[PDB]
Design an enzyme around this catalytic site. Structure first.
Site, PDB file in Angstrom:
ATOM      1  N   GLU A  11       3.384  -6.938  21.982  1.00 38.73           N
ATOM      2  CA  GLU A  11       3.522  -6.499  23.361  1.00 38.73           C
ATOM      3  C   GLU A  11       4.260  -5.195  23.490  1.00 38.73           C
ATOM      4  O   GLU A  11       4.181  -4.539  24.516  1.00 38.73           O
ATOM      5  CB  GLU A  11       4.332  -7.582  24.101  1.00 38.73           C
ATOM      6  CG  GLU A  11       3.580  -8.890  24.236  1.00 38.73           C
ATOM      7  CD  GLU A  11       2.430  -8.787  25.204  1.00 38.73           C
ATOM      8  OE1 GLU A  11       2.200  -7.810  25.873  1.00 38.73           O
ATOM      9  OE2 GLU A  11       1.689  -9.854  25.244  1.00 38.73           O
ATOM     10  N   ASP A  20      -0.536  -2.924  32.393  1.00 38.44           N
ATOM     11  CA  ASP A  20      -0.973  -3.582  31.203  1.00 38.44           C
ATOM     12  C   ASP A  20      -2.430  -3.231  30.879  1.00 38.44           C
ATOM     13  O   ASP A  20      -3.028  -2.375  31.538  1.00 38.44           O
ATOM     14  CB  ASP A  20      -0.659  -5.074  31.260  1.00 38.44           C
ATOM     15  CG  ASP A  20      -1.645  -5.881  32.017  1.00 38.44           C
ATOM     16  OD1 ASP A  20      -2.581  -5.411  32.582  1.00 38.44           O
ATOM     17  OD2 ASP A  20      -1.423  -7.164  31.936  1.00 38.44           O
TER      18      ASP A  20
END
Ligand SMILES: [Cl-]
Ligand SMILES: [Cl-]
Length: 162
Positions: A11, A20
């Protein structure tokens, strides 16, 4: 290697609000803020999560605190889920981490939709599961990450992260 180091690799770490892979407002270590297209909405969710007026920027400790909370929730979601628990209980330690990784990324609900893969994992049919897991939007959209998790399930080792 452990779940924390694994997800931190997948991540990354960002201290300002960002979008994202799906274009959703996120911060820290993959902490989703909202799916709303509004930045103000994202800033609001952010302040509420942290407990202060952040202005869209948090510190490292703050990011880590959200992350601990998120990992914990992920595991707990698995254990509370009737379709997930039994899979999770049947797996070894490395593979449990791969299952948590998926739950962190896509939510308990998303994971529970891989019914067929889940059954293969429970039966310990590693190669077959790997093939089934790859026939998914998940693999097509974030192929490098999905490959890493899939290899983890296939081998029961951390080699993809080494
Ligand atoms: Cl929160
Ligand atoms: Cl990817």
């Amino acid at each position: 290697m452990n779940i924390f180091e694994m997800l931190r690799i997948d991540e990354g770490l960002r201290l300002k609000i960002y979008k994202d892979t799906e274009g959703y407002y996120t911060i820290g270590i993959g902490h989703l803020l909202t799916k709303s297209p509004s930045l103000n909405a994202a800033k609001s969710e952010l302040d509420k999560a942290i407990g202060r007026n952040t202005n869209g920027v948090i510190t490292k400790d703050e990011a880590e605190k959200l992350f601990n909370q998120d990992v914990d929730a992920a595991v707990r979601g698995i254990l509370r889920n009737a379709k997930l628990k039994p899979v999770y209980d049947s797996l070894d330690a490395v593979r449990r981490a791969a299952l948590i990784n998926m739950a962190f990324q896509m939510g308990e609900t998303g994971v529970a939709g891989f019914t067929n893969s889940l059954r293969m994992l429970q039966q310990k049919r590693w190669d077959e599961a790997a093939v089934n897991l790859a026939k998914s939007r998940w693999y097509n959209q974030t192929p490098n990450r999905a490959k890493r998790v899939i290899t983890t399930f296939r081998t029961g080792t951390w080699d993809a992260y080494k």
